mmCIF file of C-alpha atoms in Angstrom:
data_model
loop_
_atom_site.group_PDB
_atom_site.id
_atom_site.type_symbol
_atom_site.label_atom_id
_atom_site.label_comp_id
_atom_site.label_asym_id
_atom_site.label_seq_id
_atom_site.Cartn_x
_atom_site.Cartn_y
_atom_site.Cartn_z
ATOM 1 C CA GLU A 6 -3.199 -1.998 -15.162
ATOM 2 C CA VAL A 7 -6.600 -1.552 -16.850
ATOM 3 C CA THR A 8 -8.838 -0.697 -13.911
ATOM 4 C CA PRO A 9 -12.229 -2.402 -13.397
ATOM 5 C CA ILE A 10 -14.132 0.755 -14.337
ATOM 6 C CA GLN A 11 -12.055 1.214 -17.532
ATOM 7 C CA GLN A 12 -12.790 -2.410 -18.354
ATOM 8 C CA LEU A 13 -16.532 -2.037 -17.895
ATOM 9 C CA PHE A 14 -16.636 1.091 -20.076
ATOM 10 C CA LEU A 15 -14.880 -0.983 -22.763
ATOM 11 C CA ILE A 16 -17.361 -3.836 -22.336
ATOM 12 C CA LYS A 17 -20.230 -1.375 -22.903
ATOM 13 C CA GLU A 18 -18.882 -0.737 -26.430
ATOM 14 C CA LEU A 19 -17.724 -4.310 -27.162
ATOM 15 C CA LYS A 20 -21.189 -5.786 -26.479
ATOM 16 C CA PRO A 21 -23.476 -2.807 -27.034
ATOM 17 C CA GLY A 22 -26.878 -3.101 -25.410
ATOM 18 C CA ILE A 23 -25.584 -5.226 -22.516
ATOM 19 C CA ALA A 24 -27.542 -4.470 -19.346
ATOM 20 C CA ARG A 25 -26.388 -7.173 -16.868
ATOM 21 C CA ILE A 26 -22.974 -8.833 -16.383
ATOM 22 C CA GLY A 27 -21.757 -11.590 -14.057
ATOM 23 C CA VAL A 28 -18.389 -11.631 -12.284
ATOM 24 C CA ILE A 29 -16.920 -14.811 -10.828
ATOM 25 C CA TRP A 30 -14.622 -13.681 -8.011
ATOM 26 C CA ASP A 31 -12.069 -15.826 -6.166
ATOM 27 C CA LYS A 32 -12.535 -15.324 -2.420
ATOM 28 C CA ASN A 33 -8.772 -15.892 -2.079
ATOM 29 C CA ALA A 34 -7.830 -13.121 -4.499
ATOM 30 C CA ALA A 35 -6.086 -10.011 -3.204
ATOM 31 C CA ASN A 36 -7.768 -6.579 -3.085
ATOM 32 C CA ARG A 37 -11.400 -7.585 -2.470
ATOM 33 C CA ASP A 38 -12.028 -4.393 -0.450
ATOM 34 C CA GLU A 39 -10.882 -2.270 -3.403
ATOM 35 C CA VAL A 40 -12.278 -4.229 -6.352
ATOM 36 C CA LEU A 41 -15.743 -5.189 -5.130
ATOM 37 C CA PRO A 42 -16.872 -1.622 -4.208
ATOM 38 C CA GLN A 43 -15.308 -0.384 -7.456
ATOM 39 C CA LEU A 44 -17.451 -2.843 -9.436
ATOM 40 C CA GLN A 45 -20.612 -1.370 -7.891
ATOM 41 C CA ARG A 46 -19.455 2.164 -8.710
ATOM 42 C CA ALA A 47 -18.573 1.000 -12.234
ATOM 43 C CA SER A 48 -22.096 -0.440 -12.544
ATOM 44 C CA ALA A 49 -23.796 2.833 -11.593
ATOM 45 C CA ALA A 50 -21.478 4.774 -13.924
ATOM 46 C CA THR A 51 -21.857 2.583 -17.012
ATOM 47 C CA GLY A 52 -25.507 1.596 -16.685
ATOM 48 C CA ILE A 53 -24.642 -2.136 -16.633
ATOM 49 C CA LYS A 54 -25.764 -4.113 -13.584
ATOM 50 C CA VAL A 55 -22.794 -6.060 -12.144
ATOM 51 C CA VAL A 56 -23.610 -9.202 -10.133
ATOM 52 C CA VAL A 57 -20.704 -10.792 -8.245
ATOM 53 C CA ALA A 58 -20.601 -14.490 -7.342
ATOM 54 C CA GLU A 59 -17.727 -15.429 -5.058
ATOM 55 C CA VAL A 60 -16.014 -18.824 -5.149
ATOM 56 C CA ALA A 61 -13.215 -20.439 -3.163
ATOM 57 C CA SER A 62 -12.997 -23.946 -4.618
ATOM 58 C CA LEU A 63 -13.845 -25.771 -7.814
ATOM 59 C CA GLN A 64 -17.036 -27.229 -6.325
ATOM 60 C CA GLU A 65 -18.372 -23.691 -5.848
ATOM 61 C CA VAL A 66 -17.817 -22.698 -9.468
ATOM 62 C CA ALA A 67 -20.754 -24.583 -11.028
ATOM 63 C CA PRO A 68 -23.459 -23.627 -8.470
ATOM 64 C CA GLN A 69 -22.344 -20.006 -8.386
ATOM 65 C CA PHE A 70 -22.367 -19.739 -12.188
ATOM 66 C CA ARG A 71 -25.898 -21.211 -12.338
ATOM 67 C CA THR A 72 -27.028 -18.555 -9.844
ATOM 68 C CA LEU A 73 -25.696 -15.857 -12.194
ATOM 69 C CA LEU A 74 -27.583 -17.365 -15.138
ATOM 70 C CA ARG A 75 -30.956 -18.371 -13.652
ATOM 71 C CA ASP A 76 -31.398 -15.937 -10.765
ATOM 72 C CA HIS A 77 -29.919 -12.900 -12.548
ATOM 73 C CA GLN A 78 -29.974 -13.638 -16.314
ATOM 74 C CA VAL A 79 -26.557 -12.055 -16.909
ATOM 75 C CA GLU A 80 -25.555 -11.510 -20.545
ATOM 76 C CA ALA A 81 -21.780 -11.951 -20.268
ATOM 77 C CA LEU A 82 -19.143 -13.312 -17.919
ATOM 78 C CA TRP A 83 -16.320 -11.073 -16.675
ATOM 79 C CA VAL A 84 -13.191 -12.447 -14.930
ATOM 80 C CA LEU A 85 -10.808 -9.898 -13.443
ATOM 81 C CA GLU A 86 -7.786 -11.949 -12.305
ATOM 82 C CA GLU A 87 -6.363 -15.470 -12.328
ATOM 83 C CA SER A 88 -3.905 -15.708 -9.448
ATOM 84 C CA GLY A 89 -5.522 -18.805 -7.889
ATOM 85 C CA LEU A 90 -8.654 -20.839 -8.652
ATOM 86 C CA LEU A 91 -9.356 -18.930 -11.855
ATOM 87 C CA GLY A 92 -5.914 -19.752 -13.206
ATOM 88 C CA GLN A 93 -6.660 -23.507 -13.092
ATOM 89 C CA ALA A 94 -7.517 -25.248 -16.353
ATOM 90 C CA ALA A 95 -10.624 -27.009 -15.032
ATOM 91 C CA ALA A 96 -12.179 -23.768 -13.753
ATOM 92 C CA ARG A 97 -11.290 -21.889 -16.951
ATOM 93 C CA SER A 98 -12.689 -24.667 -19.132
ATOM 94 C CA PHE A 99 -15.916 -24.936 -17.137
ATOM 95 C CA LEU A 100 -16.579 -21.200 -17.162
ATOM 96 C CA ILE A 101 -15.869 -20.646 -20.866
ATOM 97 C CA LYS A 102 -17.932 -23.660 -21.924
ATOM 98 C CA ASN A 103 -20.953 -22.876 -19.793
ATOM 99 C CA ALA A 104 -20.849 -19.169 -20.653
ATOM 100 C CA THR A 105 -20.658 -19.954 -24.380
ATOM 101 C CA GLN A 106 -23.426 -22.544 -24.240
ATOM 102 C CA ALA A 107 -25.591 -19.856 -22.594
ATOM 103 C CA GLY A 108 -24.810 -17.365 -25.374
ATOM 104 C CA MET A 109 -22.576 -15.227 -23.118
ATOM 105 C CA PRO A 110 -19.238 -13.773 -24.252
ATOM 106 C CA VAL A 111 -16.360 -14.020 -21.784
ATOM 107 C CA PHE A 112 -14.226 -10.982 -20.958
ATOM 108 C CA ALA A 113 -11.012 -12.393 -19.568
ATOM 109 C CA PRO A 114 -7.805 -11.333 -17.777
ATOM 110 C CA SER A 115 -5.186 -12.945 -20.025
ATOM 111 C CA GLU A 116 -4.512 -14.458 -23.435
ATOM 112 C CA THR A 117 -4.535 -17.980 -21.917
ATOM 113 C CA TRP A 118 -8.304 -17.585 -21.666
ATOM 114 C CA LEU A 119 -8.496 -16.436 -25.271
ATOM 115 C CA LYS A 120 -6.513 -19.493 -26.387
ATOM 116 C CA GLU A 121 -9.319 -21.520 -24.808
ATOM 117 C CA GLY A 122 -12.365 -19.648 -26.107
ATOM 118 C CA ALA A 123 -12.792 -16.312 -24.299
ATOM 119 C CA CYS A 124 -13.517 -13.317 -26.555
ATOM 120 C CA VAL A 125 -11.576 -10.271 -25.363
ATOM 121 C CA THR A 126 -8.756 -9.240 -23.100
ATOM 122 C CA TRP A 127 -6.853 -5.992 -22.763
ATOM 123 C CA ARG A 128 -3.497 -4.432 -22.011
ATOM 124 C CA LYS A 129 -2.222 -0.923 -21.320
ATOM 125 C CA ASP A 130 0.521 0.272 -23.665
ATOM 126 C CA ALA A 131 2.183 3.710 -23.744
ATOM 127 C CA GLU A 132 -0.516 4.797 -26.219
ATOM 128 C CA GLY A 133 -3.211 3.542 -23.815
ATOM 129 C CA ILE A 134 -5.596 0.570 -23.927
ATOM 130 C CA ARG A 135 -4.935 -2.111 -26.512
ATOM 131 C CA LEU A 136 -7.409 -4.918 -27.188
ATOM 132 C CA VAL A 137 -6.572 -8.561 -27.808
ATOM 133 C CA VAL A 138 -9.395 -10.467 -29.468
ATOM 134 C CA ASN A 139 -10.090 -14.131 -30.262
ATOM 135 C CA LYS A 140 -11.126 -13.376 -33.846
ATOM 136 C CA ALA A 141 -13.033 -16.609 -34.402
ATOM 137 C CA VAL A 142 -15.166 -16.432 -31.249
ATOM 138 C CA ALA A 143 -15.584 -12.657 -31.304
ATOM 139 C CA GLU A 144 -16.964 -12.705 -34.835
ATOM 140 C CA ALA A 145 -19.434 -15.457 -33.910
ATOM 141 C CA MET A 146 -20.539 -13.558 -30.789
ATOM 142 C CA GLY A 147 -21.133 -10.235 -32.535
ATOM 143 C CA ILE A 148 -18.387 -8.331 -30.698
ATOM 144 C CA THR A 149 -17.946 -4.761 -31.968
ATOM 145 C CA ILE A 150 -14.757 -2.691 -31.688
ATOM 146 C CA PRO A 151 -15.160 0.984 -30.661
ATOM 147 C CA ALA A 152 -13.862 3.279 -33.391
ATOM 148 C CA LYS A 153 -11.093 4.689 -31.161
ATOM 149 C CA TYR A 154 -9.616 1.182 -30.811
ATOM 150 C CA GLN A 155 -9.961 0.076 -34.444
ATOM 151 C CA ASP A 156 -6.194 0.600 -34.901
ATOM 152 C CA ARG A 157 -5.298 -0.652 -31.390
ATOM 153 C CA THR A 158 -6.685 -4.175 -31.679
ATOM 154 C CA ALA A 159 -4.693 -7.386 -32.145
ATOM 155 C CA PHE A 160 -6.100 -10.805 -33.041
ATOM 156 C CA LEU A 161 -4.891 -13.939 -31.233
#
């Protein structure tokens, strides 16, 4: 319900100064032909380079994440959905741990990720976007809340 471009405009204010972000995308997720071109348009619009690494199985997760970190030096990890591989505990755990140990915040699709260490997720209420934040991790990572959302932010 929060579109990819809305999400990336939020990320710009949540981690100000970010210039490069990595997306781990499940090759078996629905809507690739919509989402992946939208991410490139979101990149041009926000000024944040978006690098996508696609994965189909758990053995692809580690090598594809390392490519995001060493080849592209991304500054955060962004996960857009969790219907399949990215809803499995082992993939979630691996991605949060390795992002965090590289100094990267994780922007995540659901509160399950926050319960495990991701920083921010989002929802769309009748009054618009509302932010859900892992207070402990977000404070450590230097996450900043845009003024418009100061009153529309819940802590896990």
